[PDB]
């Protein structure tokens, strides 16, 4: 058993490393997913401003008219 | 021995990935700031002369 | 291995501090830049109001 053991021991010791880094990896990939989610939310803030630009367009037409009238 | 290379691997598993991804974030942020400035400039200067002329 | 795990848990604890304190200071810098960008508004706006009157 001491011989088969060598294989069992090396695999758990490395399997543990899968976990040693997966613990770092999940935190990293979760970060990426999360940041992509944040980027939307901040893009939406910019989209609020996009609508403001259309409000400005109407304001501009009103001024063209009131300034002329 | 590999346990030591493996603890060292946190740096060789590339701490600099952080530096690289961060650099990409600092970078892309600036690239997109320039795109913003361009769109903001389109709007910021498109005005006013008619009103002041009128 | 008992000894090496001591060393490489110690290195780990050291890295915990190094990585998080490096990042902490990097955010302090970005934070102040952004916050200052906000405070300069208010510094300018005092005169914006005066300018608006005339």
């Amino acid at each position: 058993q001491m011989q088969n053991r060598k294989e069992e021991i090396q695999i758990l010791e490395m399997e543990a490393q899968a976990a040693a880094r997966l613990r770092q990896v999940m935190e990293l990939r979760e970060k990426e997913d999360r940041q992509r989610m944040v980027r939307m939310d901040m893009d939406i803030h910019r989209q609020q401003e996009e609508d403001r630009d259309n409000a400005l367009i109407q304001q501009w037409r009103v001024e063209d008219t009131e300034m002329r009238l | 021995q590999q346990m030591k290379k493996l603890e060292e691997e946190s740096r060789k598993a590339i701490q600099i990935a952080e530096n690289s991804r961060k650099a990409d974030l600092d970078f892309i942020d600036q690239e997109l700031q320039k795109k913003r400035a361009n769109d903001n400039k389109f709007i910021a200067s498109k005005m006013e002369e008619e009103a002041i002329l009128n | 291995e008992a000894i090496l795990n001591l060393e490489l848990k110690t290195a780990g604890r050291i890295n915990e501090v190094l990585n998080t304190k490096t990042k902490d200071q990097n955010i302090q810098s970005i934070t102040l830049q952004a916050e200052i960008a906000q405070k300069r508004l208010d510094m300018k706006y005092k005169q914006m109001e005066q300018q608006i009157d005339q």
Partner: peptide
């Protein structure tokens, strides 16, 4: 990024305000 954006975007108002003030 968003703050400097917001600021420079905000000041477009001041230019709009200049037009509104004019009339």
């Amino acid at each position: 990024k968003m703050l400097e954006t917001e600021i420079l975007k905000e000041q477009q108002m001041r230019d709009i305000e200049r037009e509104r003030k004019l009339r």
